[PDB]
Short mmCIF file of C-alpha atoms and ligand atoms in Angstrom, two decimals:
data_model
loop_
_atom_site.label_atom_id
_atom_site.label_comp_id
_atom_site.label_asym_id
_atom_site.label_seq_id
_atom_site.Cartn_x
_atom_site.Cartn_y
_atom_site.Cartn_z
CA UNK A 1 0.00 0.00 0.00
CA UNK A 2 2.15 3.50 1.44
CA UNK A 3 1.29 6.38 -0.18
CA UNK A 4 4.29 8.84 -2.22
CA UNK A 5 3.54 12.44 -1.19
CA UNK A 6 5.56 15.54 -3.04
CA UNK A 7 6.83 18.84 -1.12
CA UNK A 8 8.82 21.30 -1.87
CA UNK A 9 11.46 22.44 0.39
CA UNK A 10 12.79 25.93 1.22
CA UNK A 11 15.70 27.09 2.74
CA UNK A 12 18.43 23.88 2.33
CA UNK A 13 20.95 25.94 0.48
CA UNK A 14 23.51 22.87 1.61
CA UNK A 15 23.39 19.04 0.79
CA UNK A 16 23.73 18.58 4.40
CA UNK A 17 20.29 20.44 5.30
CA UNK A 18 18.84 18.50 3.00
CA UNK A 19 20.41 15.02 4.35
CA UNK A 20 19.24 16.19 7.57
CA UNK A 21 15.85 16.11 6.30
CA UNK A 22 16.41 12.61 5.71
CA UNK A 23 17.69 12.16 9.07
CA UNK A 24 15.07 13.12 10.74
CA UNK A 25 12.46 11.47 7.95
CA UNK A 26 14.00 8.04 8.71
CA UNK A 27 13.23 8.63 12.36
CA UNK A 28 9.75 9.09 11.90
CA UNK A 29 7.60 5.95 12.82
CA UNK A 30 6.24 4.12 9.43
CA UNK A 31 8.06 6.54 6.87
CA UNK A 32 9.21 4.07 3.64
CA UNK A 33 11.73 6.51 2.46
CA UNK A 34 12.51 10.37 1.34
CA UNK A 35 15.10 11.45 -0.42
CA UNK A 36 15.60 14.91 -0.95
CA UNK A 37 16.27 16.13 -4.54
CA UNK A 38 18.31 19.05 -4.84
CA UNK A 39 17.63 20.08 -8.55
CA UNK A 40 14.13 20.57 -8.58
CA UNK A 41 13.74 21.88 -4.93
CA UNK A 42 11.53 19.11 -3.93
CA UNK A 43 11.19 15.81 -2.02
CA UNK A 44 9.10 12.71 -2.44
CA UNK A 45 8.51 11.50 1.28
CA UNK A 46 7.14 7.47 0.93
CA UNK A 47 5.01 6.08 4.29
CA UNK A 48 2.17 5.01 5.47
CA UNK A 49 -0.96 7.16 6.51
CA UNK A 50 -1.44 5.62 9.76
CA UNK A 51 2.05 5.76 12.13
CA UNK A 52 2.92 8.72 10.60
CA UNK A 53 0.93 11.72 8.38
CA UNK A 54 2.04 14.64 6.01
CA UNK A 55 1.19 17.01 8.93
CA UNK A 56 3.59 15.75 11.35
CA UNK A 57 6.45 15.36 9.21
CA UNK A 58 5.90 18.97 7.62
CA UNK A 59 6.29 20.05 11.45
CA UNK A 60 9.81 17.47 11.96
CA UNK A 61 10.79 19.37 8.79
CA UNK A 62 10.39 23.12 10.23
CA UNK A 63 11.78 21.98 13.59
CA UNK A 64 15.14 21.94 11.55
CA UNK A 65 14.54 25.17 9.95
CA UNK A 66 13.89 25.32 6.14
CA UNK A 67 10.26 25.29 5.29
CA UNK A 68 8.56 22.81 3.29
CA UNK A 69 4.86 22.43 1.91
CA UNK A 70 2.69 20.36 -0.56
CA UNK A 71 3.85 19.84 -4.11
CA UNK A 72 2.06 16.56 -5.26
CA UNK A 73 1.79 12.72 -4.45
CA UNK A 74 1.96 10.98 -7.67
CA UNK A 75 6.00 10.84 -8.52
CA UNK A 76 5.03 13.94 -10.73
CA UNK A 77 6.77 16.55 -9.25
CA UNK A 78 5.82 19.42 -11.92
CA UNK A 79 7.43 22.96 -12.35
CA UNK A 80 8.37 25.02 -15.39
CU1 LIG B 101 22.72 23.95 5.01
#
């Protein structure tokens, strides 16, 4: 089942921040994976709706300082 869910992220202006992100992704309870893809600005955060939720991990996300916030949930990504 999971479900793939798309954000963008502001503010990682080092591969580090972003790795952090992952860090603290991996430490949340029923999370399959999220890596962060600096290119596009944007991750696409893997899990399950029911240890874990968009919500909380937007928050885990903030508590290290860069912002993030919805972008899709469909490995679509989109931009210009
Ligand atoms: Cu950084």
């Amino acid at each position: 089942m999971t479900e793939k869910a798309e954000f963008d992220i502001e503010g990682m202006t080092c591969a580090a921040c972003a790795n952090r992100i992952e860090k603290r992704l991996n430490k949340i309870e029923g999370v399959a994976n999220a890596p962060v893809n600096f290119a596009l600005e944007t991750v696409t955060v893997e899990y399950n709706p029911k240890e874990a939720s968009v919500s909380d991990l937007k928050e885990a996300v903030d508590k290290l300082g860069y912002k993030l916030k919805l972008k899709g949930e469909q490995d679509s990504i989109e931009g210009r």
